[PDB]
């Protein structure tokens, strides 16, 4: 299930001119463009090797759409301050998330759009892509404004049409990188923490995509609560993750780690061995 | 590709 996503962040900095504005695009778990407001001449520039070939027409367009969004997000941040009756002195955050997903057939499966204000759900484009969901009664004035303006129509047209068209083009341009499944290299490590307990850590290294399931089990069934670490980038496009379980010292060989990844034809079972 | 329009809240 392939996806084209963009993550937009606008942070108001009162007195210090216009808000900070950052736009980043993703195909699946691979960033490919970015627009940062901090520059004398800020532009949309490539952030994947396969995106270098595209022309001025593409970058000029993507630059204009990005700087037009920043401008609208500056008005949005003024408006939201008004809705919540907040001080003009304080810094506030507007986040915008949108993407289109392809199904197994390789056709449009679904689109989504959300706004958040100060790291909390504000306004959500509904499944139909023709109506919104206000989570606060403040977002209600935004819903009525968007319905009046028929915003959801122009978003629907992008998500269903433009988004699907270009996700295909990106998936073609450097498929060598995007369509390659990289299985996790997996091992168990052991770390005594006390006299009576040791940590068993299940490693998943150099895997893509980011999606992975690490779970600990004990032979003939008390397993303690797994410490699952936030999946992290290696910096080369692949991802790393570990799942730890605190365990009585001497009993390490009873516990099995189970790794599920798209790039593994069947699930992998690991067991610590001295 | 970016959407040409951003919703005005």
């Amino acid at each position: 299930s392939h996806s084209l996503k963009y993550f937009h962040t606008s942070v108001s900095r009162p007195g210090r001119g216009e808000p900070r504005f950052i736009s980043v695009g993703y195909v699946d778990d691979t960033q490919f463009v970015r627009f940062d407001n901090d520059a004398a001449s800020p532009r949309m520039v490539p952030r994947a090797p396969w995106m270098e070939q595209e022309g001025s027409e593409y970058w000029d367009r993507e630059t204009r759409s990005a700087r037009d969004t920043a401008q609208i997000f500056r008005v949005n941040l003024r408006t939201l301050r008004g809705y919540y009756n907040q001080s003009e002195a304080g810094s506030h955050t507007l986040q915008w998330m949108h993407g289109c997903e392809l199904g197994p057939d390789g056709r449009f499966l679904r689109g989504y759009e959300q706004f958040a204000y100060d790291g909390k759900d504000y306004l959500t484009l509904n499944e139909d892509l023709r109506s919104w969901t206000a989570v606060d009664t403040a977002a209600q004035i935004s819903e009525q404004k968007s319905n009046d303006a028929s915003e959801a129509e122009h978003q629907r047209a992008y998500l269903e049409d433009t988004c699907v068209e270009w996700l295909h083009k990106y998936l073609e341009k450097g498929k060598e990188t995007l369509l390659h499944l990289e299985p996790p290299k997996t091992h168990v490590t052991h770390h005594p923490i006390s006299d009576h307990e040791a940590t068993l850590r299940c490693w998943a290294l150099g895997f893509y995509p980011a999606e992975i399931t690490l779970t600990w089990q004990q032979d003939g069934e008390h397993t303690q609560d797994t410490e699952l670490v936030e999946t992290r980038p290696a910096g080369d496009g692949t991802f790393q993750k570990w799942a730890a379980v605190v365990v009585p010292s001497g009993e390490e060989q009873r516990y099995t780690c189970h790794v599920q990844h798209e790039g593994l034809p069947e699930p992998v079972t690991l067991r610590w061995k001295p | 590709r970016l959407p040409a329009k951003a919703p005005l809240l």
Partner: T-cell receptor
Amino acid sequence: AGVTQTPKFQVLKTGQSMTLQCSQDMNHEYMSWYRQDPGMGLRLIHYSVGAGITDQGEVPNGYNVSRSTTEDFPLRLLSAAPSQTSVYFCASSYSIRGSRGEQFFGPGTRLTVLE
Amino acid sequence: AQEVTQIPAALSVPEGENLVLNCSFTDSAIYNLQWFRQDPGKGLTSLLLIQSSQREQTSGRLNASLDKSSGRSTLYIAASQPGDSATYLCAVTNQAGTALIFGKGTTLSVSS
């Protein structure tokens, strides 16, 4: 009420600096500057979506604007050139996207630049 | 970009006759279409505004229709009078929906 523009006529020598005045008392967030030539009608010079926010239009070069207030949106010619001979129209609207879309125009400023 | 064309560019008709002014625009994704009249030596006065969600707007002898899909607007002028003589300008919202883009207008002359 409505949109005000001064002056109505103006002759400039090439290289002279001149500010075309525009204001509205309708508390409109959205204001714009257009030039009308006998050929190819109205082209956008600069536009504003609120106080302190300004951006380039279709033919921005040779022109500056500032939006210090909701009321005022002056157009500045830094160095006047004969090609900037045209009629200049200031326009405001309560909204660009919503139902209150009605755009109001000023009476227009005729300007000819001579060497 | 967004390119607005107005067909015809010049039209001269005897009074009492029905006539149509057209407006085509390259990008169908617009919020609002607006028709203006320009009397010589003066500015634009807005005749009609059609939201994306609306199909037509009437104002006396003037009915404007909006075909988003085909990217067209038709202003029908019923029983033309000499007082209709002017330049008629069509405008739609730009790509970003922050300002109006104008066609080059239609010069109308209703002969007495």
